[PDB]
Amino acid sequence: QFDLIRLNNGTIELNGILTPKAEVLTIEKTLNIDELESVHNTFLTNILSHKLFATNTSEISVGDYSGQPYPTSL
Amino acid sequence: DVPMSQPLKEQEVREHQMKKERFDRALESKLLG
Amino acid sequence: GEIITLQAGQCGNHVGKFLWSQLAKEHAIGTDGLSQLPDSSTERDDDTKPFFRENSRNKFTPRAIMMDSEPSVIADVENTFRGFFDPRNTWVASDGASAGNSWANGYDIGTRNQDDILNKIDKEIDSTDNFEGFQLLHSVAGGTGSGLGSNLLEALCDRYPKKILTTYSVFPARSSEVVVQSYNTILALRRLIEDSDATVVFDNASLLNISGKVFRNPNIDLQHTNQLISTIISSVTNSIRFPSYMYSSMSSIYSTLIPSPELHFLSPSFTPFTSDHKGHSSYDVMLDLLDPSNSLVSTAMNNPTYFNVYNTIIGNVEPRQISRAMTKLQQRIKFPSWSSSAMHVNIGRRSPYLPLQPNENEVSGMMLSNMSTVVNVFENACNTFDKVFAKGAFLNNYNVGDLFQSMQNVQDEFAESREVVQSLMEDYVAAEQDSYLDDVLVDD
Amino acid sequence: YDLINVLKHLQQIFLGYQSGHNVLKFLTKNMGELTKHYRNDNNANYDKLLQNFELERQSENPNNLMRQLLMIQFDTETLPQVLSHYLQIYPAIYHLKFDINIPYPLNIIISRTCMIKYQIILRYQLVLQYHSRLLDETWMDLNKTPSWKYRGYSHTVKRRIVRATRVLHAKMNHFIKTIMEYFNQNVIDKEVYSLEKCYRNPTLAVAIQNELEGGLTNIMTNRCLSDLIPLQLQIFDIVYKFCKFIKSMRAKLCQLDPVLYEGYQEDAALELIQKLIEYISNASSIFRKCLINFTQELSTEKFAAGIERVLYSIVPP
Ligand SMILES: Nc1nc2c(ncn2[C@@H]2O[C@H](COP(=O)(O)OP(=O)(O)O)[C@@H](O)[C@H]2O)c(=O)[nH]1
């Protein structure tokens, strides 16, 4: 039941306020349309966020000794 | 009429409590207050 | 650390019946192997796993191998524990009854069945991931009992060289049967001295000295007093079953109990208790425990040397009481000049399901110690042995299997077994002397 | 929120209250994994232990949020460096620590102050458990591996090396556990009862917050964290060293005794005996110096039940 966010620093964050139990003093985590699209975009982005595919940016380390983006060599 | 000292337990308690306080104050500072 | 109980001979199986009964009470599990608890509360605040193969089902299977030559003792237990025990872990020496009360007979049947016995042991080890060890329940002078224990021990000490196999040795009061029973004791004891892990001594004489006061007399019977044996066993594992945060392992337990590679036979004591417990203070329980009147071994010494003293108090213990008791105990224990006296005191827990728990504002507990006089439990057997197996019928006509390949393997096995026992006694005595380490630690 | 359940979970995690069971299973699995990062190692490859942790965490009942949120992280200062700073202890092993992202609203009571104190307590206890566990393994080797079987080395080895090793070891086992029993019984358990009895049927949120931090401070202020750490550290170095000496040197000694070595007939084994004797004599001396210094420090509090029990286990007959 716990909605937990894993962070890269090891933190597991509860996603929001911890709610009380059903016993109180006095539902489903479904996705909406944008959320579904977002998940999909996130996914494709993640594939292409892998370092080896970053051929459109100066941020890709261009190999090391070859001096080229990994896909050039591949 | 005489140069009498303060209470012994009270001083012991204060030494204990002051130690506790110094420590907690140091921790509060690291947490930036 | 998973533990497998080995129930050998009728004594071992009768003792197990009491042990498992107490465990079923401690962990509210029925005789059918089911939790007695509602499942409305899924957290039990205990761990039955080391003793039971809790199933995916509401089933707790005792981690035990039931072994005998006489299937009726096992059946008496299985027929009580109607679903609790797994019958596939039951072995009976069906290929001939033991030829009388000789460890050799028990040994010979175990030897022939050694592979089958081990297969059952491994079927249960296969149900344990973190297997740590075994608990062997047996009489010391029974044919099937000590013989099976001798076979089990030889098979297991080599097959599982890194696992812990402890022994729960039940000693008959010495009587005329000793002309056979002392060699069963002595030769099976040789095997224990050489191969067994820490062993605890239960002297039937003391079970009776005590049961004559605490059991419903006339039934103060040794198979009835298995509750006293069970009380000690369950007390020892209480730190495992309802673990606290200090001692959670057998290896941790023995780290302060075993001073050398020598097998030590330890002497338990216990007071007060409830079974089918209102002590006043832990102060008093600890002090009361350092008294032979609460002992299950009739060492009867006024000034024995103690080594490795440990006790566990379970209940609402006040640390001030504990400290005061240690203060005085520290001043009145005999121990060698070469070792500071360190008493180890552990605090345990009452089962959350113990029916007594809601009204327990009282404490009780157990003491275990390494006594230079623990060996007194073997004295009458030894003196008998020296006079009887030097040359009597008792030496050769009770031997079967390898023990009687020739008389030579009798004459020397018996003499050597006596010597192994003599050495055990000599070392308990050597440890009483300052010279034990004065000829060690300043030898440079 | 069942705050009490949350709290027992927290206690089980950082005090290890009633959880020696879980301390041991994790500690044992990773016992040898606590040997390298502090030896000046810029260890960025302990991900395997991190993963072992996560895998173990995954086995826990999901209802226990406090376990579900637990994380392993590393520091730059080891426990005694941290303590010397905070307790103004007249001034190097283990950078590991755990935390929990305590969610709102419960984090209003379980403050960061509480959590940092919890890390300190836990690290302290884990260190003691580490050394205890090393000693537990050590007697298992000494009294089980057939080095105990050596005879063919004479009494000139049996006494001054074998009995000497085993007794020094036992003294150490008794010392470490005595201290641990003290800490857990005279420090941790009483604070836990305080928390439960201060609770019972509480009237003030503040009182709860107060006792929680209060007890944790009382622990932080324990003489064992304040005054005695420098010697505990000497003992810890001693335990580690003797435990690593054992098994390795145990095996080496087999070359002298034909019961295992049988080939051998070398002065090298005789050199081994002399090395073992000198090592052991020094081993005894440094252990005793620590015990002496320890005893002496305890004796100067200018006056203790939890101290007297410790001294009892130390002071020679
Ligand atoms: N305390 C105790 N003693 C027992 C029990 N059962 C039998 N004895 C003792 O066991 C000794 C011999 O071993 P036993 O297992 O009974 O016989 P075996 O099956 O033929 O080996 C006898 O001297 C009895 O006094 C028991 O359950 N508890």
Author numbering:
A (entry chain D): 678 to 703, 715 to 762
B (entry chain U): 112 to 144
C (entry chain A): 3 to 278, 286 to 453
D (entry chain C): 413 to 503, 556 to 726, 751 to 791, 801 to 814
List passages from the publication reporting this PDB structure.
Microtubule (MT) nucleation is regulated by the γ-tubulin ring complex (γTuRC), conserved from yeast to humans. In budding yeast, homologues of the grip-containing proteins (GCPs) GCP2 and GCP3 (Spc97p and Spc98p) and two copies of γ–tubulin (Tub4p) form a 300 kDa complex (γTuSC). Spc110p, a distant pericentrin homologue, recruits this complex to the nuclear face of the spindle pole body (SPB), while Spc72p recruits it to the cytoplasmic face. In yeast, the CM1 motif is required for seven identical γTuSCs to helically assemble into a γTuRC at the SPB.
Although close to MT symmetry, the γ-tubulins within each γTuSC were too far apart to correctly match the MT lattice, adopting an open conformation. Realizing that this would require much higher resolution of Spc110p-γTuSC interactions, we focused on obtaining higher resolution structures of the ‘open’ (γTuRCWT) and disulfide trapped ‘closed’ (γTuRCSS) filaments containing Spc110p by collecting new datasets on a direct electron detector and incorporating symmetry expansion and 3D classification into the data processing pipeline. To improve the resolution, we performed symmetry expansion followed by focused classification of segments containing three adjacent γTuSCs. The resulting reconstructions were at a resolution of 3.6 Å and 3.0 Å for the γTuRCWT and γTuRCSS filaments, respectively. During the transition from monomer to assembled open state (as seen in γTuRCWT), the γ-tubulins move in the same overall direction, approximately orthogonal to the plane of the Spc97p/Spc98p contact interface. The center of mass of the γ-tubulins shifts ~13.8 Å and ~15.6 Å when bound to Spc97p and Spc98p, respectively, as a result of twisting the helical bundles in Spc97p and Spc98p. Notably, much of the bottom three helical bundles show only minor changes when assembling to the open state. The dominant changes occur on loop Spc98pH10-S1 in the middle contact, which moves ~4.1 Å, and at the N-terminus of helix Spc98pH11, involved in the top contact, which moves ~6.6 Å. During the transition from the assembled open γTuRCWT to the engineered γTuRCSS closed conformation, the γ-tubulins on Spc97p and Spc98p slide past each other in roughly opposite directions, undergoing translations of ~6.9 Å and ~7.7 Å, respectively.
